[PDB]
């Protein structure tokens, strides 16, 4: 469980933090 | 160079309606998040929202969720912040921002590029 | 949409090491981000993931974590240096309805770091 999302877009992609 | 620049600043009266802009240019629009926030004078930066270009898919801060609109116009790399009625509270100094996908062993995003900001003045 | 709390104001004489904390009850697994804006300017990204600073950001900005804190701690403190600082981050809440996810960019109330000259 990560904390990225729009993963699927690799441009559209936010990442909030580390994973797990 | 890589920029975003801002409507011009305006005074308007309560219950006016109104639509502010921020044009980019440099990179490609429709593939970084706008982000917007206010600053009230003397105040801290508040976040508005943020949408992304592409597809107009948008996240608004609770407090202005129906207040106010976002929007880009893709032909002409620009994106919108509008009011159907302006409120005192809402005098403030708008920027308009990007945000920016670093990639790399973990991935993050932070905003990067800001506008020069339009001050907006709602009084009567 | 938990509160990110940083001191209203620090002050710090050039050259000694100036300190900005910042904390809020996720930051122990929320990425943080500082900006910096001189009164009546654009703001300044300055670091970002906690602790990588962007090209052009003197080294001696350093970004620190440490439990629900986040630390920028600035070394031989110069006079550009003064101006209000902002740390950031985010929080998200998948809504129940199924589908549906709501994303947060948060923003501290600021700190204005004075350089005593």
């Known amino acids: 469980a990560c904390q990225a999302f729009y993963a699927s877009s690799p441009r559209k992609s936010i990442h909030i933090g580390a994973c797990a | 160079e890589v920029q975003l620049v801002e409507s011009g600043g305006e005074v308007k009266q309560p219950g006016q309606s109104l639509k502010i802009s921020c044009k980019s240019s440099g990179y490609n629009f429709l593939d970084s998040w706008i982000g917007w926030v206010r600053q009230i004078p003397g105040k801290g930066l508040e976040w508005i929202g943020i949408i992304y270009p592409d597809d107009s898919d948008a996240h608004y801060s609770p407090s202005f969720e129906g207040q106010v609109t976002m929007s880009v116009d893709k032909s002409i790399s620009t994106a919108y912040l509008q009011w159907t009625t302006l409120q005192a509270s809402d005098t403030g100094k708008y920027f308009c921002?990007?945000?920016?996908?670093?990639?790399?062993?973990?991935?993050?995003?932070?905003?990067?590029?800001w506008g020069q900001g339009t001050m907006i003045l709602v009084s009567s | 949409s938990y509160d990110l709390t940083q001191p209203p104001s620090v002050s710090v004489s050039p050259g000694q090491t100036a300190s900005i904390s910042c904390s809020g009850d996720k930051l122990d697994d929320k990425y943080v981000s500082w900006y910096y804006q001189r009164p009546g300017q654009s703001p300044v990204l300055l670091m970002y993931q906690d602790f990588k600073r962007p090209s052009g950001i003197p080294e001696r900005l350093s970004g620190s974590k440490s439990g629900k804190t986040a630390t920028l701690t600035i070394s031989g403190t110069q006079s550009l240096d003064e101006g209000d600082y902002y740390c950031?981050?985010?929080?998200?809440?998948?809504?129940?309805?199924?589908?549906?996810?709501?994303?947060?960019?948060?923003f501290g109330d600021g700190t204005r770091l004075t350089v005593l000259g």
């Open positions: 950031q981050a985010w929080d998200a809440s998948t809504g129940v309805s199924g589908g549906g996810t709501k994303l947060t960019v948060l």
């Open positions: 921002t990007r945000l920016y996908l670093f990639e790399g062993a973990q991935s993050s995003n932070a905003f990067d590029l």
